[PDB]
Amino acid sequence: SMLTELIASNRRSAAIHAFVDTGLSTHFKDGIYVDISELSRKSGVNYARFSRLCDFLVEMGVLVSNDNKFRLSDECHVFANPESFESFMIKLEICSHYSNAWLMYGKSLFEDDGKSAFEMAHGRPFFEYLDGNKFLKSNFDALMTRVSNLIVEKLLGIYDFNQHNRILDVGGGEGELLVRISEKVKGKHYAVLDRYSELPVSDNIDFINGNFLNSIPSGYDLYILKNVLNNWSDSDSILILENFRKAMDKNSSLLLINMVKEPEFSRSFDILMDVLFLGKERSFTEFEYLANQAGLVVQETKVIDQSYSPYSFIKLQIK
Amino acid sequence: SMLTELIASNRRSAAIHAFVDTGLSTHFKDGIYVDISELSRKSGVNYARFSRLCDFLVEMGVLVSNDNKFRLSDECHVFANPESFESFMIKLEICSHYSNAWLMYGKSLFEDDGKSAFEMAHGRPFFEYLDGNKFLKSNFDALMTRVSNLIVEKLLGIYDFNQHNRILDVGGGEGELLVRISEKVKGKHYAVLDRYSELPVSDNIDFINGNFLNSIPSGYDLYILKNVLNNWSDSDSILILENFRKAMDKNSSLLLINMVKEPEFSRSFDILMDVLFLGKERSFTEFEYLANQAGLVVQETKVIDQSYSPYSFIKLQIK
Ligand SMILES: Nc1ncnc2c1ncn2[C@@H]1O[C@H](CSCC[C@H](N)C(=O)O)[C@@H](O)[C@H]1O
Ligand SMILES: Nc1ncnc2c1ncn2[C@@H]1O[C@H](CSCC[C@H](N)C(=O)O)[C@@H](O)[C@H]1O
Ligand SMILES: O=C1c2cccc(O)c2C(=O)c2c(O)cc(O)cc21
Ligand SMILES: O=C1c2cccc(O)c2C(=O)c2c(O)cc(O)cc21
Numbered sequence: 279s280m281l282t283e284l285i286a287s288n289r290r291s292a293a294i295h296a297f298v299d300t301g302l303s304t305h306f307k308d309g310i311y312v313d314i315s316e317l318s319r320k321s322g323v324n325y326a327r328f329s330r331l332c333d334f335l336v337e338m339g340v341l342v343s344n345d346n347k348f349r350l351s352d353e354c355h356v357f358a359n360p361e362s363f364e365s366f367m368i369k370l371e372i373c374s375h376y377s378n379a380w381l382m383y384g385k386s387l388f389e390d391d392g393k394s395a396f397e398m399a400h401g402r403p404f405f406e407y408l409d410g411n412k413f414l415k416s417n418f419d420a421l422m423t424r425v426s427n428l429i430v431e432k433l434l435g436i437y438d439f440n441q442h443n444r445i446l447d448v449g450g451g452e453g454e455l456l457v458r459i460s461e462k463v464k465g466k467h468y469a470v471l472d473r474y475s476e477l478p479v480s481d482n483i484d485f486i487n488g489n490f491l492n493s494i495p496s497g498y499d500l501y502i503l504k505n506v507l508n509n510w511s512d513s514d515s516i517l518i519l520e521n522f523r524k525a526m527d528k529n530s531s532l533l534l535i536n537m538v539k540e541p542e543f544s545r546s547f548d549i550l551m552d553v554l555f556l557g558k559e560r561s562f563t564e565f566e567y568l569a570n571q572a573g574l575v576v577q578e579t580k581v582i583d584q585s586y587s588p589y590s591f592i593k594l595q596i597k
Numbered sequence: 598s599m600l601t602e603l604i605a606s607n608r609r610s611a612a613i614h615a616f617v618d619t620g621l622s623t624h625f626k627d628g629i630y631v632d633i634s635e636l637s638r639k640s641g642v643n644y645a646r647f648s649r650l651c652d653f654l655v656e657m658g659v660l661v662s663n664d665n666k667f668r669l670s671d672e673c674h675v676f677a678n679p680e681s682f683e684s685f686m687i688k689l690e691i692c693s694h695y696s697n698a699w700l701m702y703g704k705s706l707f708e709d710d711g712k713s714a715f716e717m718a719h720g721r722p723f724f725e726y727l728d729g730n731k732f733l734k735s736n737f738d739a740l741m742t743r744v745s746n747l748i749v750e751k752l753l754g755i756y757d758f759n760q761h762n763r764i765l766d767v768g769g770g771e772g773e774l775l776v777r778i779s780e781k782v783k784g785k786h787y788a789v790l791d792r793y794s795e796l797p798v799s800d801n802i803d804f805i806n807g808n809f810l811n812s813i814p815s816g817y818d819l820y821i822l823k824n825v826l827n828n829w830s831d832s833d834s835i836l837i838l839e840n841f842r843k844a845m846d847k848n849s850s851l852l853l854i855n856m857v858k859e860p861e862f863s864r865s866f867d868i869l870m871d872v873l874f875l876g877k878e879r880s881f882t883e884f885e886y887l888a889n890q891a892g893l894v895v896q897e898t899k900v901i902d903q904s905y906s907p908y909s910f911i912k913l914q915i916k
């Protein structure tokens with residue numbers, strides 16, 4: 279039934295995971311039709327059992343079937359690329375750590391100790407745990423790098439970066455955003471702040487080991503905070519924006535860039551942020567409220583359109 | 598996007614699991630509208646975070662929102678009952694053992710050792726593992742009991758059981774099917790064969806500790822095999838049906854009752870049977886082939902409509 283297939287929603291994720299995580303999807307490059315008999319002889323995958331998985335992937339719209347051959351749908355071409363954002367997403371989505379986090383989600387709703395379902399499962403908050411787990415950190419940092427690489431073109435389009443001199447990306451991870459911005463917008467100073475046990479190295483990039491809960495360094499006229507506040511509570515979000523106000527002078531600008539909560543789109547991500555971080559996906563007005571509480575003023579707001587979600591672009595300056 | 602929410606299908610199952618497994622859903626009996634403010638004060642669940650879960654359950658069509666209150670949808674009334682088949686289904690669906698089995702699914706497609714993804718994860722085949730695991734066994738045996746209870750009325754309706762004298766249910770589990778049949782069809786000999794470390798006890802039911810891979814006891818004129826063959830390969834399925842033909846005389850009947858593979862319905866269950874058992878959901882034609890290889894003939898074929906899935910009713914006799 280529709281109700282039992284809704285209960286069995288996990289089977290869709292798990293089917294895609296088996297298809298992608300094995301690298302079987304990498305045989306479906308450039309919308310080529312694949313003979314499963316040939317793929318079975320080549321890769322050693324069981325013909326009959328993989329044929330049944332392919333049938334389920336057709337039902338899901340991941341594959342298209344014609345004359346007993348299978349190609350990836352136009353929309354799912356990304357699964358042929360193991361470096362794609364979608365490839366890293368599914369590898370994390372149903373990994374043992376996320377699964378065990380979800381199994382503590384119910385119990386976490388009855389606790390007021392400020393411990394996420396992830397922390398209740400694993401004994402540390404998400405980012406602290408990633409320090410001791412390379413599988414989670416490498417895949418998570420790689421996903422953030424891919425979505426950073428996707429948005430850069432449209433971000434340069436809507437805001438003049440040439441007016442600025444000194445640019446700091448706060449929680450910039452591997453620093454892919456500013457590496458890409460520096461290629462187009464040259465002659466500037468570029469710095470990336472994150473939690474680094476070993477500093478990354480890149481041409482024209484000053485990598486800083488820091489903690490945006492404690493302080494943000496002053497002496498930059500442009501600050502960037504992309505996909506950070508979704509990982510934090512309202513009070514921790516205010517504390518971060520307060521550290522920005524303390525760091526910023528009258529001619530400083532902060533670009534607050536996040537996936538925005540539209541009524542039209544799914545709440546599934548909002549729940550994942552609760553499970554992993556005790557975070558949430560916020561609306562424009564919710565972001566504006568946090569900024570005003572921290573002593574920051576909205577100078578301009580824009581919407582950036584990305585394939586997977588709309589983004590909220592919010593320019594902030596001090597009162 | 599539609600692709601990223603398809604990747605994130607597991608989030609639907611996990612959200613439902615949190616709502617049902619905690620017993621929060623049992624506050625929504627008889628389609629009543631629930632004040633979440635009051636439920637939070639009563640149960641101690643966090644208001645703001647559970648409100649966000651409820652908004653996701655509305656999006657899924659599990660809850661309906663009116664007058665700043667929430668009720669279960671007509672179809673999802675079953676979630677209010679912790680005794681319901683649907684409640685046992687979601688408890689198993691994303692449990693750690695199923696999750697770890699799914700994470701071995703991809704790797705299992707490249708092996709030819711006859712080890713299910715479940716066995717690769719846990720070190721024993723499903724039913725042998727359940728012998729040592731009270732959570733898995735109790736919940737699985739409970740699920741099978743509920744679906745056995747649901748079908749019995751329609752099963753008695755489409756087949757005359759009064760013509761028979763000695764009835765054996767092979768792999769009959771807790772024995773729910775024959776217990777309910779014996780209440781309506783009186784003055785018969787009733788036997789249930791399964792794997793029992795301790796024999797169940799029930800008025801006028803002969804419980805047998807057996808192995809249908811080894812032998813089926815002779816001297817019964819009616820045999821029942823319901824939701825068994827989906828747990829077995831083609832060769833193991835033939836072996837079971839061969840053991841039936843050796844046990845059956847010319848006057849004997851075997852009722853082969855299974856959820857049937859119809860092109861209209863989802864292939865998700867077929868894949869789950871691969872992961873847990875190296876089994877499969879089969880069509881009428883596929884069942885007929887196996888029966889013919891075992892030396893049995895299809896005399897009667899009917900379809901039984903159940904809420905969650907259509908059932909194939911196949912009456913077999915020896916050649
Ligand atoms: N206390 C802290 N100080 C600095 N960075 C932190 C931090 N806690 C978490 N982070 C970083 O915050 C980032 C959240 S993910 C966002 C990465 C990047 N801005 C992008 O949009 O792609 C991670 O890189 C994480 O390491
Ligand atoms: N080798 C074996 N011999 C006998 N029963 C077996 C078996 N292997 C598995 N079983 C049993 O087969 C059943 C499969 S589930 C089916 C239960 C019941 N017929 C129903 O439809 O509700 C379980 O009860 C399991 O314990
Ligand atoms: O896919 C994302 C993602 C995509 C775009 C923007 C994002 O911020 C995220 C994000 O934060 C995230 C996450 O925190 C944990 C995940 O398992 C997956 C994702
Ligand atoms: O829900 C079912 C189910 C329903 C009806 C008839 C069934 O046979 C089953 C079944 O076999 C099964 C299973 O083997 C493992 C599960 O996690 C769930 C189910």
Ligand code: NA
Nearest residue numbers: 663664665666
């Ligand atoms: Na009203």
